[PDB]
Amino acid sequence: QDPFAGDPPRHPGLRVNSQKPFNAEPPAELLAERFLTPNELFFTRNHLPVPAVEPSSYRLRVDGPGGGTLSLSLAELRSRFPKHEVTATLQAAGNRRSEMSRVRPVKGLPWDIGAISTARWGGARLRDVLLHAGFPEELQGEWHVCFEGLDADPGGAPYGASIPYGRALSPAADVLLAYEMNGTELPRDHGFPVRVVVPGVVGARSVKWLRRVAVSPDESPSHWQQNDYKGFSPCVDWDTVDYRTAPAIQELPVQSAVTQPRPGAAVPPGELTVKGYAWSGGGREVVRVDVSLDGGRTWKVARLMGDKAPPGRAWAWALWELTVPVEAGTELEIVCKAVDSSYNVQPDSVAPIWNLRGVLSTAWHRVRVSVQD
Amino acid sequence: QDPFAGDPPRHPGLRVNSQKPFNAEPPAELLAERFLTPNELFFTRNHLPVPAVEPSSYRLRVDGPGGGTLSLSLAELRSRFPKHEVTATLQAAGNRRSEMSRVRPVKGLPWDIGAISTARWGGARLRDVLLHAGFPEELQGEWHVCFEGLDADPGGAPYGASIPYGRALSPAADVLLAYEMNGTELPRDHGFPVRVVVPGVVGARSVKWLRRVAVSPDESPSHWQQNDYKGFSPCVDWDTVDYRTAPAIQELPVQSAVTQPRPGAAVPPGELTVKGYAWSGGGREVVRVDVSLDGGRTWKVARLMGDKAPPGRAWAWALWELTVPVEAGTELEIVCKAVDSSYNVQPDSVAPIWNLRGVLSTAWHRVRVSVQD
Ligand SMILES: Nc1nc2c(c(=O)[nH]1)N[C@H]1C(S)=C(S)[C@@H](COP(=O)(O)O)O[C@H]1N2
Ligand SMILES: Nc1nc2c(c(=O)[nH]1)N[C@H]1C(S)=C(S)[C@@H](COP(=O)(O)O)O[C@H]1N2
Ligand code: MOM
Ligand code: MOM
C-alpha cells in the first residue's frame, strides 16, 4: 500500500540516512567541490511523501488582507512578477548532529557535515506577490506569513512554517517564491513547481511544494513551527522540555566544517590542501576562517574563495582552502572555525551546546588524519 | 600647561584605568544593580580632553546632498524634530580585555567586566535630520555617514567614526542624535550638548561632542575607523597586522558576565544569588543564560529580568539572576554564557579568540569563590 511508491528517483551516490521519508546529503568529497551545488546532489530533506504535481492545474493560494482569496496559477506567477534571482545556502537545523550524539545520544536524523547546500534560486519576490494581493508595506504589531505545503501526514496535517511579516515585505531580505533552481525548473525532491526560499534562515522555513501563503497575527500553528526547531539548554531533557520557553529558530549562527581531507585518512607528505565551507545566518558575511593542525592551539588564516555580496546580504556560504606543510608520520588534528561580520564566533566544544534534539551543532569541526612516511 | 585642566569632575567611586584621558568603569558591585545605569556611574571612555561647550553658540554642521551646508543650533535640534527615546547599551570594544591579557599581554586600556552601561537616550532621529537636510531614503551603492567630534589631538585631527547610510536612514535602527541621557541633559563626560547613539553597535561609533555629519562614498577616513576597532586571528602580531584585511567592528557578538559575587569572595552557606548581565549586538535579543557552579560541566537556566523589546530591537542588556544551594566549605567556579535570538553562543575559552589589540573578549566569564563553613 506504499505511500512512497510515488517518490522520485535519486542520484545513487548520496549519503542516505532515511529512505522513507527521503533524507540524504551529498558525499563530503563532493560537498565543497563547487560553489553551486548541482541539483542532483543538493541535500534533500523530506518529512513526507513527495507530492505529485500536475503543473497546469496547480494553483497557489494567497489570501488578501480582507479575507478574500486570490489564487495564482504557475504561468501567472512567472509572468505577473519580475523574476529575481538569489543565490542562497540552505542548512538543516540539525546539520552536524552526529557530533552531538557522540557526546550523548539524541533523537533525530543523524546528519554528518553535509546537511547544507547552495543553489541559485529564481522566481517571484514574495514581497511582490503580497503587495499584489493587496497588503501594505507595513502592518501594525507583530505579524507573520504562513506557508503550507502540499505534502500532509496520514491524518491530513500539512507541513508548515512561518516568517516575520517584516522579513517577507523587505526588499533586502530577498525572500523568493522560487520556481527555478540552478537554472532549471525545481526538481520534485526540491519542491516542484514552487517553493519558498528564505535566505539567511534555517532550512526548516523554506516550505516546498507550496500551496498557501496566509498572513496572520501569529506564527504558523503547525507542529514544526511550534514543537520543533528550537534550541534549549544542555540541561533540558525529554521530560522537562517546554517549547513555549524558546524562540523558533529563524536565523542561524556562524558555522564551518572541514570537507577535505576526511577523518582517518592518511595523506602524503610535503603539502596538504585543506578545504572547507563557512556560512552565517542573517545575511551576515563570513570574514575570516582560522585553521589548526594541532587541535586548536595554533591557527592560521585560510583563504576565502567566492565574491563578496552586498552588505547584510551574504546568503551564500564561503568556501575556503589552505595549503600547508606536513611531516612524515605525524598525526594531525585539523580544526576550523569561522567569524562573521558581527564578529560572532564558534564555540570550542560540543558538550556545552548539547541539546536534547541535536540542533544547532556549530562547535569547532575536528578531523583526525595521519601523514604517511 | 595642562590640556586636561578643563575636564569635568567625576564620581569618586569609579574604577579608573586612565586619568588623562579619563577612562573608567562603575564598580562591578553596582554595575548590574539597576537596569538603567545612573549617569554618574555610566562607563566613560575618552580619547582626548573633554571639550568645553558653550550651548547657545553651538552649531552642528550637516552637509546636504549637493555639497551645500545646513547648520543646526541646539535649540533648533530640539524643536524642529520630534524627540524620540531609545534605551540602549553602550559596550566598549575592549570590554573584558583583562581576561585576554591574562593569556598573553595586549596593548590597551585594561578594562575589567564593566566597560558597558545602559541609559535611556533622547533626542533627534538621525534619519529625520538627514531627510531634513535633503537626503533621500535610499542612495545607490554603499554609502556612509561620518561624524566628527569637537575633541581633537595635539595636531588638529578630531575623533571620528562612521556608519552605513542604510543604518542611518532606517526607522528601526533607532540611531539618535541625543541631547538627553536618563532624563537629564547630556553630561560633559558623555558628550554634552550632543552625541550620536548607535544602538546595537560597538561603542566606538557613538561620536560624542558632535560637530559634523557628512554623507560619503567611504567610511570615516579617521584613525579610529581605519586603524583600530578591528578583530584579527589569534596568530596576528604587531609586525604582521594588516588593517585592510578585516571589517571595521560595527555590530557586537553575544556577551555576558557575572557581576555578583566577586572573584575570591567567600560566601555564606545555604542560598546564593548570582547576578549578571547579557547583551547582543544587532538589536538581537538575549534568549537564555546558562550558569554553572562547576566550571562549566553542568548548567542551569538563569532568570531574565527586564521587558521584552520589539523583534530586532533589543538594544538594551538583559539582567539575570539565579538563586542556588551552596555547601559548607566548597569551592565554586561560577560560569555564565548567553545565547541570542540568532542562536549565536559564546566560546568556551579565551586563547582561541586572542587578538593583538584585546578587543572582542566574550569567552565564558569565570568567577572563583569559596563557601564558608
Ligand atoms: N513541504 C515541505 N517543505 C519543506 C520540508 C518538508 O518536509 N515539507 N522540509 C523543510 C526542511 S526542514 C528543510 S531543511 C528544507 C530542505 O530543503 P531541500 O530539501 O531542498 O534541501 O525543506 C523545507 N521545506
Ligand atoms: N568625540 C568622541 N566621541 C566618542 C569617543 C571619543 O573619544 N571622542 N569615544 C568613543 C568610544 S570608543 C566609546 S566606547 C564611547 C564611550 O561612551 P561613554 O563615554 O558615554 O560611555 O564614546 C565614543 N564616542
Ligand atoms: O530539518 Mo530542516 O531544518 O533540516
Ligand atoms: O574604545 Mo570604545 O569601543 O570602548
Tab-separated table of N, CA, C and O in Angstrom, chain A residues 122-163:
chain	number	residue	atom	x	y	z
A	122	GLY	N	15.541	31.138	-8.440
A	122	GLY	CA	14.934	32.179	-9.264
A	122	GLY	C	13.427	32.082	-9.177
A	122	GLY	O	12.866	30.981	-9.162
A	123	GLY	N	12.757	33.222	-9.089
A	123	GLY	CA	11.311	33.208	-9.069
A	123	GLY	C	10.768	34.514	-8.581
A	123	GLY	O	11.479	35.511	-8.567
A	124	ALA	N	9.514	34.509	-8.147
A	124	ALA	CA	8.836	35.732	-7.777
A	124	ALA	C	9.351	36.218	-6.432
A	124	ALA	O	9.710	35.394	-5.583
A	125	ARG	N	9.381	37.530	-6.205
A	125	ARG	CA	9.689	38.027	-4.873
A	125	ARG	C	8.451	37.907	-4.028
A	125	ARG	O	7.365	38.312	-4.450
A	126	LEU	N	8.573	37.362	-2.830
A	126	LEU	CA	7.371	37.216	-2.013
A	126	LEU	C	6.767	38.590	-1.780
A	126	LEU	O	5.559	38.773	-1.854
A	127	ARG	N	7.626	39.569	-1.526
A	127	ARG	CA	7.168	40.919	-1.272
A	127	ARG	C	6.213	41.331	-2.400
A	127	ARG	O	5.123	41.837	-2.143
A	128	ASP	N	6.595	41.083	-3.649
A	128	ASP	CA	5.745	41.461	-4.773
A	128	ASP	C	4.391	40.734	-4.765
A	128	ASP	O	3.332	41.355	-4.898
A	129	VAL	N	4.409	39.428	-4.609
A	129	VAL	CA	3.176	38.685	-4.540
A	129	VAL	C	2.244	39.236	-3.474
A	129	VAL	O	1.038	39.375	-3.722
A	130	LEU	N	2.775	39.531	-2.281
A	130	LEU	CA	1.934	40.051	-1.208
A	130	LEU	C	1.382	41.406	-1.595
A	130	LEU	O	0.176	41.589	-1.570
A	131	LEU	N	2.241	42.352	-1.989
A	131	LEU	CA	1.771	43.663	-2.451
A	131	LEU	C	0.717	43.485	-3.515
A	131	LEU	O	-0.308	44.158	-3.485
A	132	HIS	N	0.933	42.555	-4.432
A	132	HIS	CA	-0.089	42.311	-5.428
A	132	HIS	C	-1.432	41.845	-4.838
A	132	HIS	O	-2.520	42.218	-5.309
A	133	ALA	N	-1.357	41.049	-3.791
A	133	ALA	CA	-2.565	40.564	-3.165
A	133	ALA	C	-3.255	41.675	-2.384
A	133	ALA	O	-4.375	41.485	-1.900
A	134	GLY	N	-2.607	42.827	-2.253
A	134	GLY	CA	-3.249	43.949	-1.580
A	134	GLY	C	-2.638	44.434	-0.280
A	134	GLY	O	-3.034	45.497	0.222
A	135	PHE	N	-1.682	43.676	0.271
A	135	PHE	CA	-1.114	44.023	1.575
A	135	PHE	C	-0.315	45.322	1.474
A	135	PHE	O	0.099	45.712	0.370
A	136	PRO	N	-0.166	46.037	2.601
A	136	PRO	CA	0.652	47.257	2.666
A	136	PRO	C	2.143	46.936	2.945
A	136	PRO	O	2.476	45.780	3.219
A	137	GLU	N	3.016	47.946	2.884
A	137	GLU	CA	4.441	47.753	3.192
A	137	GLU	C	4.637	47.343	4.651
A	137	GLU	O	5.578	46.640	4.991
A	138	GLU	N	3.718	47.780	5.503
A	138	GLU	CA	3.917	47.743	6.930
A	138	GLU	C	2.589	47.502	7.641
A	138	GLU	O	1.602	48.198	7.378
A	139	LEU	N	2.562	46.515	8.537
A	139	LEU	CA	1.393	46.258	9.378
A	139	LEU	C	1.724	46.637	10.792
A	139	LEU	O	2.857	46.558	11.214
A	140	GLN	N	0.721	47.059	11.531
A	140	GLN	CA	0.928	47.417	12.920
A	140	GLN	C	1.005	46.190	13.825
A	140	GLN	O	0.025	45.444	13.920
A	141	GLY	N	2.143	45.999	14.497
A	141	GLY	CA	2.245	44.977	15.527
A	141	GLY	C	3.086	43.884	14.920
A	141	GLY	O	3.728	44.129	13.895
A	142	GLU	N	3.102	42.700	15.534
A	142	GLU	CA	3.935	41.616	15.035
A	142	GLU	C	3.089	40.669	14.204
A	142	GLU	O	2.156	40.052	14.702
A	143	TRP	N	3.424	40.526	12.940
A	143	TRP	CA	2.600	39.745	12.043
A	143	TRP	C	3.477	38.691	11.437
A	143	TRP	O	4.680	38.821	11.451
A	144	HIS	N	2.878	37.639	10.908
A	144	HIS	CA	3.632	36.529	10.403
A	144	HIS	C	3.029	36.072	9.117
A	144	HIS	O	1.824	36.184	8.947
A	145	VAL	N	3.874	35.563	8.221
A	145	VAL	CA	3.438	34.989	6.964
A	145	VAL	C	3.577	33.469	7.042
A	145	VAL	O	4.688	32.949	7.298
A	146	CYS	N	2.461	32.763	6.828
A	146	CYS	CA	2.404	31.289	6.983
A	146	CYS	C	2.300	30.555	5.677
A	146	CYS	O	1.488	30.909	4.824
A	147	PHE	N	3.092	29.506	5.541
A	147	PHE	CA	3.142	28.745	4.322
A	147	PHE	C	2.660	27.369	4.656
A	147	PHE	O	3.013	26.855	5.699
A	148	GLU	N	1.862	26.761	3.787
A	148	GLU	CA	1.606	25.335	3.870
A	148	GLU	C	2.064	24.638	2.610
A	148	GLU	O	1.944	25.187	1.514
A	149	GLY	N	2.580	23.424	2.752
A	149	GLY	CA	2.939	22.636	1.586
A	149	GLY	C	1.840	21.676	1.177
A	149	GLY	O	0.812	21.546	1.848
A	150	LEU	N	2.053	20.994	0.064
A	150	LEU	CA	1.075	20.060	-0.450
A	150	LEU	C	1.139	18.712	0.245
A	150	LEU	O	0.141	18.003	0.324
A	151	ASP	N	2.326	18.359	0.727
A	151	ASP	CA	2.541	17.125	1.487
A	151	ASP	C	1.874	17.214	2.859
A	151	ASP	O	2.101	18.172	3.586
A	152	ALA	N	1.041	16.229	3.197
A	152	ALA	CA	0.387	16.162	4.514
A	152	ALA	C	0.609	14.771	5.073
A	152	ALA	O	0.959	13.872	4.307
A	153	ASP	N	0.399	14.597	6.385
A	153	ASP	CA	0.615	13.310	7.071
A	153	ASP	C	-0.571	12.351	6.883
A	153	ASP	O	-1.542	12.699	6.196
A	154	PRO	N	-0.501	11.140	7.483
A	154	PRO	CA	-1.649	10.223	7.411
A	154	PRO	C	-2.957	10.964	7.674
A	154	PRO	O	-3.894	10.825	6.882
A	155	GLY	N	-2.992	11.759	8.758
A	155	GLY	CA	-4.215	12.450	9.230
A	155	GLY	C	-4.487	13.886	8.769
A	155	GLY	O	-5.067	14.698	9.514
A	156	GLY	N	-4.073	14.212	7.547
A	156	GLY	CA	-4.467	15.477	6.953
A	156	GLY	C	-3.558	16.683	7.107
A	156	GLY	O	-3.548	17.534	6.226
A	157	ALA	N	-2.798	16.777	8.201
A	157	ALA	CA	-1.997	17.996	8.502
A	157	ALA	C	-0.770	18.225	7.593
A	157	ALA	O	0.100	17.349	7.468
A	158	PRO	N	-0.702	19.405	6.950
A	158	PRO	CA	0.367	19.731	6.010
A	158	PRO	C	1.608	20.209	6.753
A	158	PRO	O	1.520	20.567	7.938
A	159	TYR	N	2.757	20.171	6.090
A	159	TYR	CA	3.937	20.741	6.668
A	159	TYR	C	3.774	22.227	6.530
A	159	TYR	O	3.255	22.684	5.517
A	160	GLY	N	4.213	22.984	7.530
A	160	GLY	CA	4.007	24.413	7.528
A	160	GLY	C	5.082	25.081	8.340
A	160	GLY	O	5.637	24.473	9.289
A	161	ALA	N	5.370	26.332	7.969
A	161	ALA	CA	6.302	27.163	8.700
A	161	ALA	C	5.925	28.616	8.456
A	161	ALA	O	5.105	28.909	7.555
A	162	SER	N	6.509	29.537	9.224
A	162	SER	CA	6.188	30.951	9.030
A	162	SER	C	7.378	31.858	9.243
A	162	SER	O	8.345	31.473	9.902
A	163	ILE	N	7.292	33.075	8.703
A	163	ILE	CA	8.353	34.066	8.923
A	163	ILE	C	7.779	35.424	9.274
A	163	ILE	O	6.602	35.726	9.002
